[model samples]
Target: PQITLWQRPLVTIKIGGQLKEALLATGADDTVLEEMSLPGRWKPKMIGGIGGFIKVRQYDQILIEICGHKAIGTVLVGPTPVNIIGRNLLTQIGCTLNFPISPIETVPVKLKPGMDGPKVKQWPLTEEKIKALVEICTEMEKEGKISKIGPENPYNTPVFAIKKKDSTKWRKLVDFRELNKRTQDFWEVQLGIPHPAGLKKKKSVTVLDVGDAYFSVPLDEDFRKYTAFTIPSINNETPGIRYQYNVLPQGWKGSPAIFQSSMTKILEPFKKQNPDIVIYQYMDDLYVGSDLEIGQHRTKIEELRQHLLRWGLTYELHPDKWTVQPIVLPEKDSWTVNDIQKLVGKLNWASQIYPGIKVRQLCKLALTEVIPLTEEAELELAENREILKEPVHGVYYDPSKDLIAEIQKQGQGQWTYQIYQEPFKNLKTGKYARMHTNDVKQLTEAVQKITTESIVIWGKTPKFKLPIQKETWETWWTEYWQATWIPEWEFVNTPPLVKLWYQ
Candidate 1:
């Protein structure tokens, strides 16, 4: 017998010669009864539920008669809030559920005024992709989701095949960008689809994905011509053919808005009845949130399932995607500057949910500036260091007494004394103890100026030359020169001979 899901599918069942009411729960794997006496050699077994696990007595091969149908199965007698007729017995009873046809009228694809249908060229495909496309098209056509048509239709969109996540199978999709551009807007005003950021705080959330969501809604028969797409002609086995969808085609601009509005309408009654439960929908995805306990959450999910089933809509609750507790933010050791920027940008999009997550000064700096020691920066520095080592010009300066004595002897007493005053001032201040690039440039220019002036005066080649090259001297000074302040008295009192010695 077929059953509609307008209400709880509870029926009177005969168990142990007693008539009892039980809900036919398709989600349950094993039949369960409220605490009751049964004559059998029962074993102690543990059964799990939303509330947790409980120890129950499992009686094998128990006869249960429901609506004149007899089903013999293992019955677990437990402390259940209500009796449940699980799939184990429901399958034996040959029960089937019937979903009503969708109440929402099929959407008609319309074009803008004076706009003709777009005829896009087919995209190139490999032999493997072509074979996969043929298989998919055949299957879809067989299922009445799409219908094969003659190539005479002027409206044709390009179709392509891409590898699925598994990489072994291909999924077919039609490119509708051109078609959508010419299509008239179906919605006058934006429908209020619930955004993830608008969700209220809840103890847990259950995520669901609708299977073939766009295909679930039918398309108007006369408007199907605009959705025609072509499959490329194979070498020998298959000829190119055009096909159009009998249901709403994916990649259309209006599909999401229309589907969302229809889903909101279908779920209105369910939402009103369970005011405590929060439901959020975005296209084909759905999220159900609640602050209640797990047991109560389960009931809400079951009720929603029933409501959707009544409208011929079904949802898939992925095992790994469901959450019973509050979500815990993950900890990361480090993030790149780009990663941080992307994270901040995404957080800003959901600012409504977390108003306190504003971009602070430091976070803005992180986004705008290149952070040091990051993976990319480290790689760049390493490459730069390699080129830097090739120069081989940096010389370490030792401020030992021996070096000071050498410099004193190189210059005459008067010029040497003037140079010593600068070092003494630097020692007193301690600010110029670290070498800077600007100081290197200043010292090099000073030496060049003094040498040029001495050359003009002497009018002859210098008797002595510096041991290190000019480039080497500049690099050495940049690396090790400690004094930045130059005494003005030294440049005034130094004679030509003293200047030559200083150089």
Candidate 2:
């Protein structure tokens, strides 16, 4: 029952004030070393190898511990035949094959092949566009948004311009679509507003757009190498300029998701600090709203700016820069595709505040998969709803439900979301309420939720275990609900004011 030459090579050991893995061996008379960084002083000694004699570092009085026992011993620190604890040291401690040993260390699952792929050439740019591009990129580089690089990189992608879709502004970005697919590392930007429909009515709202937002989320030094790319020129006429991203760049597949997540992480703590305030984020854009307390709104703004400053981000309260406060397009003869998009975007946002016919019409235009439509064509398509002279028959309508009505264009009045005092009525009821004078944002949101969920097709309707509640709707009665020329603008166009107005 006494300890004999137990055969296993496993044993617990420690070195340099830390636990480390080492193999026990009986074939050797001395300990070998592979950890070149281990602290020791040594003299040259011959270690036998396949190529005969190899000069190795040898040291004495090195501290080695096995199990709970400590010993001072001679150990070699180079050209190891494995990190072995030979019979020279094993006999010093009372450990053998029968002694308990730790199981092998665990590691991550092996990843799929081709996680990183080769770079692709970029689409060429124009002479004028090239200068603008160079200036924008060089500015970003000077500000540390991207890094300088050459052709040597395992991962790279081309750059291109997505133009006109954003108010004639060109968004220059690296094309990471291919890189995104190959890497298989994915992030989905959390889309849609949180609690949009639950928003309280507000007479005042503040909007803050973070400048150079995606660039705010940093890209580390190790990641910059993978983002490298080369441009043809630094100047308009020069050739061969190269660069890489030092931070998240616009239009990169993962940048939106990363930026949103990063922004949420930084903003969440501040929201918790405010017991009475609410902040909403649409990516880098933040919205602070309150019923009528301008000071409370300012407090939220201050908190937002402080949070942004803490996270090292650029922020601006563009109070006057907001153009669509009243949601109107300047009266023009016709609109272009860009014009349509702007109209749709503005209307769509307003629609989110109070969704109905005009909202769906605008959303339908925005969501349609066909080719873009011009102003006249799109207007004709939108105006094609049936002009009813009676109640939309056989549909449910409640007397107690308060309701929102769509933009009613009667006798050339402008359009907006209108709230009704009484329950909604069809053309048959022909009842009307005074024009709503408050901000339509929350109203739009409430109606958006109702409209998106309430649309039903008839004749072959699919029934469910739970029936959906019908939202109240107001019909286009006579021209009374809309503005009339005689009552509103009619006097302004009169003889005395006409000269002043024209002047």
Candidate 3:
């Protein structure tokens, strides 16, 4: 591929590695140097660098590299992830965006038209509201109510429908899972509790037995109620984004924006004070760094609780899942990357992390093995498979089949599986113990976010799914954290708290 800019030629792209190959781009936007492949950066980059205006250009280096390559891009940079090449570079060789090749070595990617500049606001990265969410989270930590459960991997996919009003309406509504293909890449931070690692290398390592927490976001009635029915960004010119009433989306181009901004406004003060406590506001999960034991941790949690109480929030404890656990990666002895996505299928215990109301089919992929790494996803899938094994349809598991027995019979479900759970030995998938009571009532006219896992989940049972889930999870969820309240002082001549006895 060769790139000719305004009749000027420059550098050539070195193909493969160390192997020199000169390529030229004709229809090419600019003489970009060094970029063999692509990750997520739009073909057009940010504004500024060598030729200033070119930063917003896909071809800033059309003049650079041939003349002067900037730091972010330069010869010293070693042929950038992939060189767009330049004048002499392109004329020396040839360039193209598409070349037929197998899964791995495909090159000469095309630049989408008008894909220049920082199009989206960096909300999760810079907004003050993000700071607030972190601050409130800090307070939760002090209350012994928070736990940072970083999944080895969080799924990324387009929106898929979770429910439908009538079978007809359900069909019309798009399941976020299907639309996820249109989503942009995003990340949820991975973190742990008790700062597992001490600040100063301690001579002896002691385990802090902080009970598991059911960590979840504090949502108002509207957001909570809307989740079962509402869809986000129905169109590209996404609206209803600014409202706090908007449901958290699993596939929004700016999900982090809404999450961080709202979260920050919720927790600003704490973020300003706790420098070490980092909150990935975009994801609404937190990371607390400390060198402390149970006692200190308790103190910290309590303090966090007090702050959250004042900030109209609460915190719930959640599982660290086998303390100091390491995520399993292929052929790797040590934990290297984030891949521990909790199971989305109902049968697996890990799926509980997703609470209910997955916006854009949030937890759907985990159940289907469509998520990244997907080590634990097998358990989720197999569980879904197991639930499918029984009579339960549209719900998860029935009490009839014993999961333990199936596993004991044969661990046959094991093959290329990294994080298999002992609980899913032989249990059928989609066999949820929880479900809608008496043929479904509480679910908004919206469609259900049913996956085989969802069907089998304790929350999806047809008999009394919602109530069961609410009674078990939601009830516990609410109690796990306390709500903020003002003292009844000057309560319009009501009862006084200073001294009262309910006789």
Candidate 4:
């Protein structure tokens, strides 16, 4: 291999058992660390380079590897720009610069041997699975989804059958890698605005999953032959079945963009009418969120569904999208690895809207291969709900229930109270305070001071009187807990743990 000075000569190297990317430079005197965070002692010393002298810290005895060679020496970490494999380090590895300074060139695949071979079948199909595949092909042919290839069809691609999530149900999939590689760049439809305001505007969200979304688009007659694949026979004596998709099938080279363009044409009229409705589509998965109330929100979604139906479209509603939040997660003992993964996927999307979730550690575990759900992992998942909270959009003001403090019911005439202070910024006085008391006079004065500085009601659904001048307490109340409550926290203090209601 020859070292070239075309640009930054960078190489993938490993240090501290972690992979690192370092630039190979002859101008540098010592190996420098500017990107990766590694444990080292800080030594203040000025160094010259990159225009002038700057202070840097020295890290001693760091191991470095280039190609097949290894070297250990002191590396500087500080005000430097890029991680450089300097001349001192490069000399130890015996790497010689041979190529002239020019733009890096790309080599053709033909020059690379033993690449681009026939696509090997990786899916295992048992007798039962093979029977299911044949039945599915027959059904698709009858429905005009696919057809038999004749002499006009020349291109032959590969296909395979893989099990669905159920592991029992099988689905035939096309191998369109060769075609996709040969095709030009694709244009992807924009994804949804999964933000707090986007979701919090309405009490519900509707996920419209289009059935056979790709199949909805018909393939060009001339190009349909390129999708041909052979379905293997059950017995050695029988000949293999050949079929090509008439409709744009799933996993095709141009299916996504083709389906997207088709959908844009269909939804244009609907988009013109429902200007207030927040509609977004990725692939064939569509979402319609709104700023309307719950009843009206349901009505608008049904109307959207009717529009799709009238246009001869097929879609299924995901109830989980709307109902799951205020989500009641399963107990630790009952949760499976798949269940954990589902929660992880859900939380990741939710975090995009309502950030500040520290469950990425737990999600990382669930996303790994073959990691079983542990009790500790479940505990973290459960704890996530406590810390992760979306901003409450609408007011939960039912005059019957107080909206200030967290109130819990005990036996008759007995109750427990957790004081909640809604943190607010007073524009009139330009001051900040956390209020919990139901003093009408103080509240009236505070309300006048309150501006739209985003009030955060910490903790669970709070029940207490809002700061108003006229409303008087009809029932008697007493305070039991002396401690204060933060906006988004829950009390785990039991009877014996702290002061409890003593009737």
Candidate 5:
């Protein structure tokens, strides 16, 4: 009788910046972070790990505040954990899970002595786990870490507008649908501007430029003085939905698309009036930048506000805070873990720029454009520059609502799976091979045959289509596997946690 060297899994922590409201999350396995808040001024690079190689960013001392506890340590933040906190950071703090409370400690299957044997199934997460989940979610509700807020915009003549589907994905914490509908029903359709003077025109200028602080003025009962519906495309039949959150959330699935749609609707009409005026909207956060002088910019911003006001919306202005020149120019690339650490006053930029700027590993940093753009990608650097200036494409996830922040609300809204990989590619062995998890990654493996080979070369999904999957060339598993219990992420205890997620 012989045995292999047994190794236990180590825990990873959330170490970018700020303090995390800790949770014993049995559902998630990886140590994740919304990279924008990663500590220090470190960059991402292709690094190896237990699963395989991945692009991850290292951070400086992550400050853990809140609950009167402060544990400062560096963390390796990666592709997971956009909303909730994860990784070994929790385990490193000596926090152990009370098994009965966390079903992750419960899977039914056990490891075997061979390579690529009967793999785990992804169904029927188990009843017990679901029950436990209810309790845990209820607890989260009590903790205020996850809860719903009222609809932020219910004015029939609203200043800002977002579609139903896009708002759902934003915070992952609340559903503002009912409130949105209520607001929609209560108000008249209009842009009415968020601010009265957001769309105003200057004394000298006859026409309105978006930069002019003007807002839409609702038409008087006699249809004079003011003109503009409070909400457009917002007729009685199709109204806006609303919700709120304690944490910044992603907009719903159709949010980005809808937001863009609204922007087009407004701008196209405005363009008809003044073709030279330009306005841009990223979801709800509008960005209006122009080369015009400070006075012109101020006038334009006000005019726009006024226009919005007429349409039933309003504007918020910080006259003293207005900046003719940005301290930091438009963010061309997506925000990374390093960005957050800096934003929240965690790292000292002058003293510790790159504490661990390794040579061979961080070659990406050496590039002129930085992380997402490779040497191969830099060929059209000029054109890519303009495209990169917009954060949505290159951004993995916006940090405004990430855990590093105090709440996930409208101001901190973001878009998910926008940055996630499409047709998800599973990495297989190259000529230079390694298999650490014994969990095969090849997407091309044929599963129908009883093969002498010790692997399932799981094949990748065909371009723009569903992934290919099949049964393996091996056998022998517990009844659960045969039953095809898709671990639907049971709410609580049922079968033992098979994957050893924390393991």
Candidate 6:
């Protein structure tokens, strides 16, 4: 039987009166199964792989049927992530590996019953733009993305031309809004593509852009009539030709959902077979990465590229986009609120890899109000800018490493202390507790004593002590403490204390 590496070669195996699925691993030396009871005397043995080593019971002379082919050999039973059929048993089965080509099945564009598309006239364009549109349609026809159709089609949509980035070329697009409104929407949702920030750092990262992404998926012939569009006439006497899409069109609402789902389905097996490699897909853009060295990373990329080609998909690999390091952030001295907001959006996505708390907090200032930033705010923004420029890399959790309990303990302690220090107001009592007379006396004595010592050091002691008479002391203490204390229990709320520690 032929098999493609783009798919996981999982085959059903019968072992010990039980049937289970196992992967056909050509590179493995011995077959390994998940732990299960077997009628035999087994010896404790160790097995090693890319993930590390584990001890398992090795059963000798085991009879296992792989896809109806019986093989008697030694099998290891252990706590494996998945059941694997190794070469030891595979050699007996006389299996061969092969890569086969595949394609996405054609999907019919479904429309609402009894509804027909509106007959919209083609939009007027300049003579040069019209000529460019004609050329584009001819090329698309040659490529089998679209085909000429008779004017008998009831549905007709307008077509327009937009200048390319070079301003020399034109891109033809159909205004499918009317057609989309009549068609039934593809309601099935696709999972959001992972952000580039979630990619593994310190690995080879390659970005791939699919060439003719939507055009790759062919549409059903019966549904092609609904996507019909007319070319603009050069002269009033000559009638323009009508054409319909043979493949999925760009402006159709269902095209993205359909294409994304198809691409994901096609790549699922490849992803499962290559567990070490990471792939992030967002429509036509693909970000492939691996923790292996550059050589192995490049090998994986090429392997995926070949597999994609086999599946009738082509991708463009830009040299500048591929790297073995973290993406470097651009630097800017000043940022408007709009710029800061945009940066915040990007940073939030990257927060998984680089959680710069201070930068995030500073960015919030822009959201509080419109910008013509204050001097201090500008300084804070600059600091945030500087913080972002510092290189950061993604960190992966190592299963073998023990958790740092000391840091956790310290963090818990600090958090508890902070909560303890925070002032708590009693709901029953309408006011905060005032200083008692004895406490007031102690505070006054400490202050007076310090003041006396400071005066003595200046070569003169105070001639008179602070008024100690009950009435005089009451007046003086009341005047002083009221000014010094706040009802919120905040004592002398000054910048110096908090600022010193924070800075």
- The TM-scores, one per candidate, come to 0.37, 0.34, 0.22, 0.34, 0.19, 0.35
Question: What C-alpha lDDT values do all the predictions have?
Answer: 0.57, 0.47, 0.29, 0.52, 0.30, 0.58
**Candidate 3 TM-score versus the reference:** 0.22
Clashes of 3: 116
Stretches of model 3 off by over 4 angstroms after superposition: 1-181, 185-253, 265-268, 281-284, 287-289, 313-503
**How well is each residue in 207-276 modelled by candidate 3, as lDDT tens digits?**
2211111123232232222222211332334331221112233322223333444455766776677654
| Top-scoring candidate (lDDT) | 6
lDDT accuracy of residue 486 in candidate 5: 11
Residue 75 of candidate 5: its Cα lDDT? 46
If the candidates were sorted by their lDDT against the true structure, best first, what order would they fall in? 6, 1, 4, 2, 5, 3
- Which wins on TM-score, candidate 1 or candidate 6? 1
Looking at model 6, the pairs that clash are none
Candidate with maximal TM-score: 1
Worst 10 residues of 6 by lDDT: 404-413
Expressed as tens digits, the lDDT of each residue in 1-503 for candidate 6 is: 67767788899999898999989899989999988887789999988899899998999899899988899999999989989999999989987775423565566567676776667776555577678778999998998778898868867887766542344666666666566556635433333444334353425557664635677667766777778887777775457778888787766656655777768788898878987766764323466867677787888888888988888887322223332222234445554677666655655544444455345344645445456546665576566556645554343333232211000011111200111111121001011122324444443433333222212122111122221344444333422231110111112222222111111
**lDDT accuracy of residue 13 in candidate 6:** 95
Model 1: what TM-score?
0.37
lDDT of 2 by residue, 16-107 (tens): 77676667766667877566555656787876665686566777887888655786677777666567786768777744455432452211
Candidate 4 TM-score, true structure as reference: 0.34
Give the winner by lDDT: 2 or 5: 2
Clashes of each: 0, 4, 116, 8, 147, 0
